[PDB]
């Protein structure tokens, strides 16, 4: 056939590339960071009703000043998680603090391009990782399976991205608010996802300072919905 | 490198079956017929050998029917070297089940790990599988007398009356036409014959053709006792029966 | 064409073209410029965003005190020679009380390379990597292509574009070389002669990236308003 | 056909394609010669001048093994790095165990192998580089060139690369004009000479010359490179000579 | 740990096993269970070095619990017999032994017999009436080889266990701070709560 | 070691052999899990290709991990075999360190984590084979149900099935499934486990087998008798 | 037809690889002979100089194996050098293990044992070279054995291997025809030296000079080659009469 | 028998005060009764304005000086040049000494 | 410098054969004719020394080779593969039998592991199955006399007489006529000789024609006396004088 670990005349990695494609099939997630916080949101995007909707964990825990929200694959992104935690645990051992949110972002980047003929094929899953901590305050990162990592003050991943990105363009300032921040989440996956948005089938997550990382519950989600579609009728 | 010459024994079709696998079950549906019948008080095994030739040494030829120990014996269809191989891997499995619990092993056990070891093949390594479907008869003192089937899938199943090899849809319509469950030893040996004598790609079952073996717990006082028949015993059962 | 399958396999004219695919990546990555004179060497590297949310990524990384380099193509690649370097700068430090060669460190990266173009399941590294560094034989300047080839030079560009400020500092090559004891006019000179590969963009104060290492001066990198000085 | 796709296949032929296609790569790299004189042996690379911002007399090509053994050779320039390094690995193993430094033709033979291994096997690519090497032993000087098929004969003259027939040329004509031989000094010059004439082949970029010796007499049977004023003096014969 | 008893009567095993786990100077514990249930018709008490004991018996529980769920069976007494015992002669040649004795007390269920097996920490095996480990047997066999039968009842076995106790109680220099019987039968394990 | 990479991506983000593995799947015979407000209910069809089987001894397709918690399928019955035996190592590791035995959602997980490990790991090929696990964790009295796939993906249903025809059986479940009030009792659960699988397996009651789960312990197979009784009050309602 | 690639079987039953190893054979374009006297064997080789720019010393296709046992190679040097190697450090090993020289023989079969291996399993490629070991064994007198790409290896009352083969065996064959004998019935390798030059010339039909032949001598207890002018010696002799 | 440990003497001394702190030592280093110096640093500036001092068996001692100084530099290389503050030295230095647990450091660590 | 052939060179092909068993089959068809007839108080085994050259010495190339003192094999197919088989069977002989019980073993066992060897090369990585085919003749203690033959995929048969290799099917139809269960070693020598000069083209004498026996214990063979329950091996090669006794009589 060919190599895992084959360039294409045009300079990247075959299986990188169509590992990008799998991202792009998957459910969408939005990360907005402030001064205020750092929120995570996800589509859940279950396949039949049948399926109890919180059972789908595509936001995660990784310490208590960091999170993880995930795109693609996420099968994939287990190993990934559980190397993250380990790394950040391990570091707290080793040296009696919290570690870097970019720190952390770099171990699990540096799992990435271990793949060949180690792993046989890169992973399938784009995550977002979310964090603070006292030297670079609040940070929002994107982790590839390229092993890249990009900071951003607002990303979207998943099927709904490219859409989702250009409305973070115009959205995003320096002044956001964490309640602002939440609403601008729920905003844009209401617009790109397929299904109505509810409490079900849409999570939101953040991460302060003061109380760390917190999945939100389905009651405060629905708060949010209904405070949001409020102030879109407002105007 | 070397990845240009690599068959992938152990990849999914588009329709998700295993090729090899399916390749391998073809080549078995060449192999001579054996087939096992599980009566009330004992079990037969019947098999049908492959190379009729008048100098083969017949009296001293074992390509059919082996021991597996003195309680499990096993009929065989298809490559018979592989099928020593994973024999010999089976009788060491007894002994270590003995050597460790004190028991001879039941017999459902054995079979899980003979057919683990197919699926290993199956799953992992890159290496082809093997060619063999077995039958297995045996007896312990939990479930009696049981006939099983593995394949080169792994996959196992439990039997009153099955056959493997050649002919296989034939000889299973005739068995599940004739078989009953009150039936005896004495009844499913001659099933067993005719079922074989009307299967068969030959002119006429003879004894220097067929292998063939009972189980009875008709032992003195209530034991087990296999009996892989000699030539001579083939050939009077077949009188006996009337089909020579 | 049948013969770039993997990096094992020549072609009919001798020509490795999984080494030249990997060449190919550093043409697509953003531009980076060394230069040095005899007391000071610079590296000046544009650094590339994905979009306007995004952070501009890190070009340039240090190795050791008196070394570091800038990347362009791969920055995954970069970070496993990088490290690297680091631990053999480190080894020559801890067991022989000496600060590396770069010449010595050049050879390193080489025979690293050539590993990966001659052996099956491996694959050429994506980058390519400009090493500069003050040593026991004054300043230097290395260009690092992951076919093996180092190459030591008083100036040099890689990168998309990087013929133009190739070119600047082939002509230039008299002036910068005598800039001796005055870091600032050096750095000017690799800020004009990166100026010389940009189209439609220009220099701003989160795009450029610049590094230093001289006679009295550790490897330090200057980002964001510490950079402002020379836009 | 597909014989050509992988190492280690014979041909119908019974060619190794692979090997040949090792060739044209050394074919395509600069040219380096070999000179066996009196006492000892020369050896002198063309490096081409790509660009006026390469640093003169830094970017060394030739090569020394142990203290004894000079090394140059054409063609994929890493390839060449990795021979000599596991050529210091053999030189080094053999000074361990037996005392004495390495002969050359027990050197050669420790390449030789090495390179022949490199075509056994689909999984490894053949060296893309032919190899001039050589020095002065116990019993004398030797010259040596290494192909990437493993093959290596003793030379009076060697020359390889893109400017090769030129150089044989120039060499033969030193073979037959003295039969009892050349000095090593007079070596470094015809060295120099036989470059300069060679680089008509690569006439486009203008070029560097670097010359190195053993000489039982001149270097005290060591390696050394020719620097300043003899290298000088050598220049300014093979310059008078093309004019 | 110090006294472990077994004995088997008519249509039981009983065990009997000391609370006390002393370390040194002081009894830290005055209620431990020195027994694991393998099987629900088949106990194993257990007494030996620090640590190695609970070890070995949980290690045997696993490996036991893990043959039920994939058979779907009980394994015998005299099966589960002879794997704890091949456990233990396979560790007595390695880099570090488990220095563990252990009686098993078990009640076969297809046979209709009770079975109790004393092996010591270098896989010594025997089938006996009543059984011991340790100092235990010096005072107990005796008693035992005067009193019992083959035909007693369990509360005449437990009678006869009262009688062992007693001896150790009187004549042994450790405080064992008194044993937690338990009766193994066609019903299973269960624990006497008075003695 | 043979190492090679059979799992990997194509052009178009798929893994194909991970695909090919749902195949199997889709191949296997119908497997359906429906859970009740105090139980959990583990439904099975048997092809009737296979007549003279002996049903004693056969493998039968819901597998006990450990006494609170069952597993059944539908794919390759061989990887199946592999995954139980994993599955009844890790719940008895789990009793012998953490003293407590595995919840359903941590069974599941592991079951999971390994069905992946082997979508990404050189020389092997995915697990032809979708789990359903089901069961109750220890000293609680809400039932659990998981769906596990050869990609290694997990999640709990309300109530599933998976194999053959599986489509036409979510579509029965789907509208006939009431959240807000599930089976109250065991009787209305298997009811509707057995009606769900007399939408696909079209013949009487030795196609069907029924595994009900309750809390504490408490698992029982029916027998073909007491299916029968099911298969009979169903069809006499039917005829109306 | 990837069957022609690595050395597993063809439809025909046949072994492509090692074929076309056979072929590499001949691409020097060398012959060689062996012939036995009574108290030696003889073994004789072309040496072909083409580049003047060569030392002629170091061109060589004979090799000292250990001291009683001498081998010709028959194809490129490279393979020749690695068969050699080899060769040497068996025949070392097995003085080691078992206390005595390694028989030619023995030596011959160890050789041919590793080459079919080579055309067994798929990742070794055969050698492309025909070995002709040469001694005066202490046990079966003088001994000539040859082995190949095909793991095929047999004694010889003499031999011939190159592109010419053909009529250097007919030649040879011929005479033994005539004679008798099993050997060279000559008491002094210097005429079985003599004998192997002069029918090497009447079969390829070309005359040598003392720089076109290569010669190794194997008597009891060493195997030695002969310089230029013990050849030159042997060719004064031959012309004399 | 080979003795791997060695007794090189010395004293060291650390206070800390409210906007300071001082880590003292003796510049003798003997072995038995002889002096081999008279001026052997023991005390060493680490970087990140950490001051150590491994008092015991000198060999050991400069071993963990060299690992922890070493240990300074690859903390900025893998976390951004971020300062290593004292208390994440001195757990760093727990587990260069625990690691050898069953061959120790034969020392008295002051930072 | 890896062996990346970690996978099976044989495979199963849609029809079910095992491709490179059916072409190492088609090899021994091509290979030298060789046959073996069981007699009650012997076993002979016959082949033709196919000389690749005059010069060469034919007597130095043994197809006939002795595996243990009661134990001989002959081939039809690649002479290599067969040189190494006979190698790798005597040591089995000694590792996996007579170090451990303190005797040979028996034809059928030994059998059974040259089988062995020959199945795994039919299904490990990176190897061709072996192209021969083996006749083994032997005798022991317990079984008496007996006639096997080993093929490439590892399968083996007990035979009363048969051939394999060039004239095979014309040689078995000839035994089959000649073949009855009262002959004796000398009656089965001379059929041997008979069915051979079929096959064979040039030259019939005892320099082109290679024949050993399974017979009596030869004690003048064992090199050693003073142990009465170590008889002598049961192998015996016949000379070229023997054989050529022998077609006088034909
Ligand atoms: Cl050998
Ligand atoms: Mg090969």
């Given at each position: ?8 005349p ?14 792009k ?24 009703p ?10 995660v ?16 992104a ?9 790394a950040?645990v391990?570091?707290?051992?080793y040296?009696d ?8 972002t770099?171990?699990?980047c ?22 603070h901590?006292?030297?670079d305050?609040?940070?929002?990162f ?12 607002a ?11 250009a409305?973070?363009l ?5 002044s ?9 989440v ?13 409490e ?8 302060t300072?003061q109380d ?24 | 490198?070397?990845?240009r ?9 588009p329709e998700?079956?295993?090729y090899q ?12 017929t ?17 190379v ?26 298809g ?24 028991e001879?092993?039941?017999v459902?056990?054995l079979?899980?790990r ?20 077995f039958?297995y ?11 099983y ?12 009356a099955?056959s ?6 034939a000889?299973?319509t005739?068995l599940q036409?004739?078989?009953?469950d ?33 189980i009875?717990?008709?032992?003195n ?14 050939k009077?059962?077949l009188?006996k029966?009337?089909?020579? | ?20 695919y990997?060449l190919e ?10 230069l ?7 590296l000046?590297?544009?650094?590339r ?8 990524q890190?070009?340039?990384?240090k190795?050791?005190?008196?070394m ?8 995954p690649?970069?970070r496993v ?5 680091r631990?053999?700068?480190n ?17 390193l ?9 001659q052996?099956?399941g491996?694959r ?7 090493i ?12 690092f ?12 560009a890689?990168?998309?574009r ?27 000179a690799?800020?004009?002669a ?10 701003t104060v989160?795009?450029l990236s610049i590094?230093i290492?001289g ?17 | 056909t ?26 395509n790299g600069?040219?380096?010669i070999?000179?066996?004189?009196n006492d000892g042996?020369?050896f002198?690379?063309?490096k081409?001048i790509?660009s ?18 000079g ?12 021979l ?5 690995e ?9 005392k004495?430094?390495?002969?050359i ?8 192998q ?19 090497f050589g ?18 004969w003793?030379?009076?003259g ?11 040329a120039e ?7 003295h039969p ?27 070029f560097?010359?670097?010359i ?12 050394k490179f020719v ?17 | 740990m110090?006294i472990?008893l077994?004995?088997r009567?008519?249509?039981?095993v009983?065990?009997a ?16 269970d020195?027994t694991?249930?393998?099987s ?6 257990f ?12 290690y045997?529980?696993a ?12 394994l015998?007494?005299?099966?589960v ?8 002669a396979?560790?007595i ?5 488990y220095?563990?004795?252990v009686?098993?007390?078990?009640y076969?269920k ?6 109790l ?9 025997v089938?006996?009436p009543?059984?011991?480990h340790?100092?235990?047997?010096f ?18 076995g ?5 009688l062992?106790?007693?001896?150790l109680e009187?004549?042994?220099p450790?405080?064992?701070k008194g ?5 193994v039968?066609?019903?299973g394990?269960?624990?006497?709560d008075?003695? | 070691?043979?190492?090679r ?9 798929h ?11 889709k191949?296997?015979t119908?497997a359906?899990?429906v859970?009740g407000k105090?139980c959990?209910?583990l439904?099975?069809?048997?092809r ?11 493998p ?5 991990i ?14 199946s075999?592999?995954?139980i ?5 890790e ?6 360190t ?6 359903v959602?941590y ?15 050189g ?16 000293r ?10 050869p990609s290694?993906?997990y ?10 025809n ?5 579509e029965?479940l ?7 009030e ?9 009811k ?5 699988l ?6 009487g009651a ?25 298969v ?5 309602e039917?005829?109306? | ?22 072929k590499?054979?001949?691409?020097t ?6 012939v ?12 072909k100089?083409?580049?003047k720019?060569?030392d002629p010393?170091?061109?060589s296709?004979?090799?000292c194996?250990?001291?009683?046992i ?13 068969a ?11 003085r080691?293990?078992?206390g ?5 023989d ?11 291996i080579?055309?067994?399993r ?13 001694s ?15 793991g ?27 004679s ?12 079985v ?25 194997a008597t ?5 080659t ?16 | ?14 206070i ?7 880590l ?17 640093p ?9 001051v ?13 000086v ?9 903390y ?11 208390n ?7 587990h260069?000494?625990?690691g050898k ?11 | ?6 996978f ?5 092909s ?13 090899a ?6 060789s ?12 082949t033709?020394?196919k ?9 130095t ?8 003192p ?10 290599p ?7 790798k069977?005597?040591k ?18 030994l059998?059974?592991?040259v089988?062995?060897?020959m199945?795994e090369a039919?299904?490990?990585?990176g190897?061709?199955?072996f ?9 022991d203690?317990?079984?008496?006399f ?6 490439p ?23 089959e ?15 041997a000789?008979?069915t ?8 019939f ?28 091996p ?17």
């Amino acid at each position: 056939d060919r190599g895992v670990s084959t360039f294409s005349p045009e300079g990247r990695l075959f299986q990188v590339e169509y590992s990008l494609e799998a991202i792009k099939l998957g459910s969408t997630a939005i990360g907005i960071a402030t001064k205020e916080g750092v929120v995570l949101g996800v589509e859940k995007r279950a396949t039949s009703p049948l399926l109890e909707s919180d059972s789908i964990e595509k936001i995660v825990e990784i310490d208590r000043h960091i999170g993880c929200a995930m795109s693609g694959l996420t099968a994939d992104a287990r190993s990934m998680i559980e190397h993250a935690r380990t790394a950040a645990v391990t570091h707290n051992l080793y040296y009696d603090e919290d570690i870097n949110v970019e720190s952390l972002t770099q171990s699990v980047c540096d799992l990435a391009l271990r793949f060949g003929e180690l792993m046989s094929r890169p992973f399938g899953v784009a995550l977002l990782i979310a964090g603070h901590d006292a030297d670079d305050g609040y940070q929002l990162f994107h982790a590839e399976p390229s092993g890249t990592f990009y900071r951003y003050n607002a990303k979207a991943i998943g099927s709904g991205s490219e859409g989702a990105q250009a409305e973070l363009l115009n959205e995003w300032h320096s002044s956001l608010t964490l309640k602002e921040a939440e609403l601008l989440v729920l905003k844009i996956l209401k617009q790109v996802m397929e299904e109505k948005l509810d409490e079900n089938n849409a999570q939101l997550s953040c991460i302060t300072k003061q109380d760390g990382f917190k999945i939100y519950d389905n009651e405060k989600t629905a708060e949010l919905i209904k405070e949001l579609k409020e102030k879109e009728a407002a105007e | 490198g070397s990845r240009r010459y690599d068959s992938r024994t152990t990849i999914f079709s588009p329709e998700g079956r295993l090729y090899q696998v399916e390749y391998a079950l073809e080549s078995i549906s060449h192999a001579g017929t054996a087939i096992g019948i599980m009566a009330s008080d004992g079990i037969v095994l019947a098999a049908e050998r492959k190379v009729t030739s008048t100098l083969l040494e017949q009296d001293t030829s074992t390509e059919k029917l082996y021991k597996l120990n003195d309680k499990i014996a096993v009929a065989v269809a298809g490559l018979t070297a592989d099928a020593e191989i994973l024999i010999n891997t089976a009788r060491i499995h007894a002994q270590n089940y003995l050597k460790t619990y004190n028991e001879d092993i039941p017999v459902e056990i054995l079979v899980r790990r003979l057919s683990d070891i197919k699926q290993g093949y199956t799953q992992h390594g890159g290496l082809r599988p093997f060619g063999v479907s077995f039958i297995y008869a045996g007896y312990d003192d939990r479930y009696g007398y049981q006939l099983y089937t593995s394949n080169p899938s792994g996959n196992y199943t439990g039997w009153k009356a099955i056959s493997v090899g050649a002919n296989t849809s034939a000889a299973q319509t005739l068995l599940q036409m004739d078989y009953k469950d009150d039936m005896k030893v004495d009844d499913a040996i001659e099933l067993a014959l005719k079922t074989l004598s009307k299967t068969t790609d030959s002119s006429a079952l003879t004894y220097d053709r067929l292998e063939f073996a009972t189980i009875r717990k008709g032992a003195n006082d209530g034991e087990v006792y296999q009996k892989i028949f000699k030539p001579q015993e083939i050939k009077d059962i077949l009188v006996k029966t009337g089909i020579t | 064409n049948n013969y770039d399958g993997d990096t094992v396999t020549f072609s009919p004219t001798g020509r490795l073209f999984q080494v030249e695919y990997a060449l190919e990546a550093i043409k697509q990555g953003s531009v980076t410029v060394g230069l040095r004179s005899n007391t000071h060497a610079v590296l000046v590297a544009l650094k590339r965003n994905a979009d306007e949310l995004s952070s501009y990524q890190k070009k340039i990384i240090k190795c050791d005190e008196h070394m570091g380099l800038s990347l362009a193509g791969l920055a995954p690649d970069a970070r496993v020679l990088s490290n690297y370097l680091r631990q053999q700068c480190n080894y020559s430090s801890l067991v022989f009380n000496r600060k590396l060669a770069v010449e010595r460190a050049g050879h390193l990266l080489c025979d690293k390379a050539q590993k990966n173009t001659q052996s099956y399941g491996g694959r050429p590294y994506g980058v390519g990597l400009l090493i500069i560094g003050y040593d026991k034989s004054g300043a230097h300047l290395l260009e690092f292509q992951p076919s093996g080839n180092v190459t030591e030079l008083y100036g040099t560009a890689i990168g998309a574009r990087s013929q133009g400020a190739k070119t600047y500092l082939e002509r230039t090559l008299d002036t910068f070389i005598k800039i001796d004891g005055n870091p600032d006019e050096l750095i000017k000179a690799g800020v004009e002669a990166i100026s010389q590969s940009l189209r439609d963009e220009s220099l701003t104060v989160d795009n450029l990236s610049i590094a230093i290492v001289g006679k009295d001066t550790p490897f330090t990198i200057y980002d964001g308003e510490a950079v402002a000085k020379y836009i | 056909t597909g014989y050509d796709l992988s190492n280690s296949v014979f041909s119908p032929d019974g060619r190794n394609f692979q090997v040949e296609y090792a060739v044209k790569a050394v074919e395509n790299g600069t040219t380096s010669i070999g000179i066996k004189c009196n006492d000892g042996v020369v050896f002198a690379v063309e490096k081409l001048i790509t660009s006026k911002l390469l640093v003169p007399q830094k970017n060394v090509k030739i090569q020394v093994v142990d203290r004894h053994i000079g090394c140059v050779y054409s063609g994929l320039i890493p390839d060449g790095r990795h021979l000599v390094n596991r050529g210091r690995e053999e030189a080094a193993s053999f000074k361990k165990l037996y005392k004495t430094p390495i002969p050359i033709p027990a050197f050669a033979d420790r390449l030789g192998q090495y390179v022949q291994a490199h075509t056994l096997y689909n999984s490894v690519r053949p060296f893309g580089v032919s190899t001039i090497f050589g020095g002065v032993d116990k019993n004398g000087a030797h010259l040596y060139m290494l192909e990437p098929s493993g093959s290596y004969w003793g030379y009076k003259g060697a020359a390889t690369g893109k400017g090769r027939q030129s150089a044989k040329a120039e060499l033969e004509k030193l073979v037959d004009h003295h039969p009892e031989g050349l000095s090593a000094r007079e070596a470094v010059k015809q060295a120099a000479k036989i470059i300069y004439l060679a680089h008509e082949d690569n006439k486009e970029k203008d070029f560097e010359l670097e010359i190195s010796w053993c000489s039982l007499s001149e270097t005290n049977g060591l390696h050394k490179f020719v620097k300043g004023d003899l290298l000088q003096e050598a220049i300014d014969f093979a310059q008078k000579e093309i004019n | 740990m110090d006294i472990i008893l077994g004995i088997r009567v008519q249509d039981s095993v009983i065990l009997a096993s000391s609370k006390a786990v002393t370390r040194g100077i002081s009894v830290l514990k005055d209620s431990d269970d020195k027994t694991r249930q393998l099987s629900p018709h088949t106990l194993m008490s257990f007494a030996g070095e620090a640590g190695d004991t609970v070890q070995f018996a949980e290690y045997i529980q696993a490996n036991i619990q893990l043959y039920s769920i994939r058979e779907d069976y009980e394994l015998s007494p005299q099966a589960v017999s002879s794997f704890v015992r091949q456990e233990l002669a396979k560790s007595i040649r390695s880099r570090r032994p488990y220095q563990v004795n252990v009686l098993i007390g078990g009640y076969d269920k297809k046979k209709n017999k009770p079975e109790l097996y004393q092996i010591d920490y270098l896989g010594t095996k025997v089938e006996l009436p009543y059984g011991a480990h340790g100092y235990s047997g010096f005072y107990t066999f005796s008693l035992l080889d005067h009193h019992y039968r083959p035909d007693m009842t369990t509360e005449e076995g437990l009678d006869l266990l009262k009688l062992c106790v007693q001896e150790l109680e009187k004549r042994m220099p450790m405080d064992f701070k008194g044993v937690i019987v338990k009766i193994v039968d066609k019903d299973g394990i269960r624990q006497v709560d008075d003695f | 070691g043979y190492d090679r990479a059979l799992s990997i991506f194509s052009p178009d983000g798929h893994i194909f052999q991970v695909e090919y593995a749902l195949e199997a799947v889709k191949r296997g015979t119908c497997a359906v899990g429906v859970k009740g407000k105090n139980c959990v209910v583990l439904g099975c069809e048997r092809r009737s290709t296979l007549k003279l089987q002996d049903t004693r001894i056969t493998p039968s397709k819901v597998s006990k991990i450990d006494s609170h918690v069952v597993l059944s399928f539908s794919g390759l019955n061989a990887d199946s075999r592999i995954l139980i035996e994993k599955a009844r190592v890790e719940a008895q590791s789990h009793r012998l360190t953490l003293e407590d035995p595995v919840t359903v959602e941590y069974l599941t997980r592991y079951v999971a984590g390994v069905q992946q490990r082997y979508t990404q790991s050189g020389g092997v090929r995915p697990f032809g084979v979708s789990t359903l696990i089901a069961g109750f964790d220890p000293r609680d009295d809400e039932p659990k149900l998981y769906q596990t796939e050869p990609s290694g993906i997990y999640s709990s249903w309300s109530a599933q099935t998976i194999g053959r025809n599986s489509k036409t059986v979510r579509e029965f479940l789907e509208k006939n499934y009431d959240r807000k009030e599930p089976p109250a009792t065991v009787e209305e659960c298997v009811k509707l486990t057995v009606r769900s699988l007399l939408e696909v397996v079209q013949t009487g009651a030795k196609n069907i087998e029924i595994t009900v789960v309750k809390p504490d312990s408490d698992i029982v197979a029916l027998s073909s008798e007491e299916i029968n009784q099911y298969v009979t009050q169903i069809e006499q309602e039917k005829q109306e | 037809g990837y069957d022609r690639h690595i050395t597993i079987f063809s439809p025909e039953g046949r072994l492509y690889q090692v074929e076309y190893a056979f072929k590499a054979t001949n691409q020097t374009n060398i012959n060689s002979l062996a012939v036995r006297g009574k108290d030696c064997t003889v073994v004789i080789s072309q040496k072909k100089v083409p580049d003047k720019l060569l030392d002629p010393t170091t061109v060589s296709y004979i090799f000292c194996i250990s001291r009683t046992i001498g081998m010709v190679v028959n194809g490129p040097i490279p393979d020749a050098r690695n068969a050699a190697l080899r060769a040497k450090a068996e025949a070392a090993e097995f003085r080691y293990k078992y206390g005595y020289d390694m028989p030619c023989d023995v030596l011959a079969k160890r050789m041919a044992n590793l080459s079919q291996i080579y055309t067994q399993r798929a990742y070794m490629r055969p050698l492309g070279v025909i070995l002709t070991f040469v001694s005066v064994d202490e046990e079966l007198g003088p001994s000539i054995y040859k082995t190949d790409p095909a793991g095929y290896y047999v004694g010889y009352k003499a031999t011939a291997t190159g592109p010419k083969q053909q009529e250097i065996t007919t030649n040879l064959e011929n005479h033994f025809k005539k004679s008798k004998i099993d050997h060279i019935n000559e008491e002094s390798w210097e005429k079985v030296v003599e004998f192997a030059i002069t029918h090497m010339i009447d079969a390829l039909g070309t005359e040598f000079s003392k720089n076109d032949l290569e010669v190794g001598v194997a008597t009891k207890d060493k195997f030695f080659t002969l310089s230029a002018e013990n050849i030159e010696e042997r060719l004064v002799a031959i012309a004399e009469q | 028998q080979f003795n791997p440990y060695g007794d090189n003497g010395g004293t060291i001394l650390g206070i800390a005060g409210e906007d300071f702190a001082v880590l003292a030592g003796d510049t003798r280093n003997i072995t038995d009764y002889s002096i081999n110096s008279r001026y052997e640093p023991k005390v060493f500036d680490c970087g990140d304005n950490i001051v150590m001092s491994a008092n015991g068996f000198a060999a050991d001692g400069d071993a963990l000086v060299k690992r922890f100084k070493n240990s300074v530099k690859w903390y900025h290389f893998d976390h951004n040049d971020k300062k290593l503050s004292i208390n994440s030295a001195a757990r760093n230095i727990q587990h260069l000494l625990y690691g050898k647990r069953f061959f120790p450091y034969y020392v008295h660590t002051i930072i | 410098m890896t062996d990346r052939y970690s996978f099976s060179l044989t495979t199963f092909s849609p029809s079910g054969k095992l491709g490179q068993i059916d072409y190492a089959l088609t090899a021994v068809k091509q290979g030298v004719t060789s046959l073996g007839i069981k007699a009650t108080n012997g076993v002979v085994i016959a082949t033709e020394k196919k000389s690749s050259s005059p010069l060469a010495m034919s007597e130095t190339l043994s197809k006939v080779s002795l595996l243990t003192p009661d134990i001989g094999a002959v081939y039809s197919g690649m002479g290599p593969d067969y040189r190494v088989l006979v190698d790798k069977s005597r040591k089995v002989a000694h590792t996996s039998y007579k170090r451990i019980y303190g005797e040979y073993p028996p034809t059928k066992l030994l059998v059974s592991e040259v089988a062995k060897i020959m199945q795994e090369a039919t299904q490990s990585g990176g190897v061709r199955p072996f192209g021969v085919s083996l006749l083994i003749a032997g005798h022991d203690e317990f079984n008496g006399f007996s006639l096997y033959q080993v093929d490439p995929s590892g399968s083996y048969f007990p035979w009363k007489a048969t051939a394999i290799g060039k004239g095979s099917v014309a040689a078995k139809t000839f035994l089959e006529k000649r073949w009855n269960d009262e002959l004796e070693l000398e009656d089965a020598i001379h059929i041997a000789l008979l069915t051979l000069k079929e096959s064979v083209e040039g030259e019939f004498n005892g320099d082109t024609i290679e024949l050993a026996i399974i017979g009596d214990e030869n004690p003048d063979l064992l090199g050693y006396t003073g142990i009465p329950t170590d008889k002598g091996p049961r192998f015996r090669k016949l000379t070229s004088q023997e054989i050529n006794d022998r077609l006088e009589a034909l």
